[PDB]
Curated annotation (Swiss-Prot), chain A:
Homomultimer. Makes the hexons and eleven out of twelve pentons. Interacts with triplex proteins 1/TRX1 and 2/TRX2; adjacent capsomers are linked together in groups of three by triplexes, heterotrimeric complexes composed of one molecule of TRX1 and two molecules of TRX2. Interacts with scaffold protein; this interaction allows efficient MCP transport to the host nucleus. Interacts with capsid vertex component 2/CVC2. Interacts with the small capsomere-interacting protein/SCP. Self-assembles to form an icosahedral capsid with a T=16 symmetry, about 200 nm in diameter, and consisting of 150 hexons and 12 pentons (total of 162 capsomers). Hexons form the edges and faces of the capsid and are each composed of six MCP molecules. In contrast, one penton is found at each of the 12 vertices. Eleven of the pentons are MCP pentamers, while the last vertex is occupied by the portal complex. Belongs to the herpesviridae major capsid protein family. Disulfide bonds: none annotated. It comes from Human herpesvirus 2 (strain HG52) (HHV-2). This is Major capsid protein. The chain holds residues 492 to 540 of 1374 of the full protein. It is found in: Virion; Host nucleus.
Amino acid sequence: AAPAGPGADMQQRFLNAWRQRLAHGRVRWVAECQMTAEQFMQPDNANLA
Amino acid sequence: SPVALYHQLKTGLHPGFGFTVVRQDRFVTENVLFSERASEAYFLGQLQV
């Protein structure tokens, strides 16, 4: 995002702006919970490809 | 639970109880065959068109 307005309220912009598509799904990284070769296996990693 | 345990195996934590694996196998073997003489009748017969 390009910045908008002062920095003083910039959270309450982005708090309410991503109030919707944040509890939607997950981010691309989940692999901090994933052990190694759980990435190498065909399930549990749609981001393998 | 079916979900509460599901974190614990996928991340790699032992939930205080264990398992026993059971599998099935199949092979291809070879055989010899022994019988005494005259161990069976084996009649022989007529042909039908």
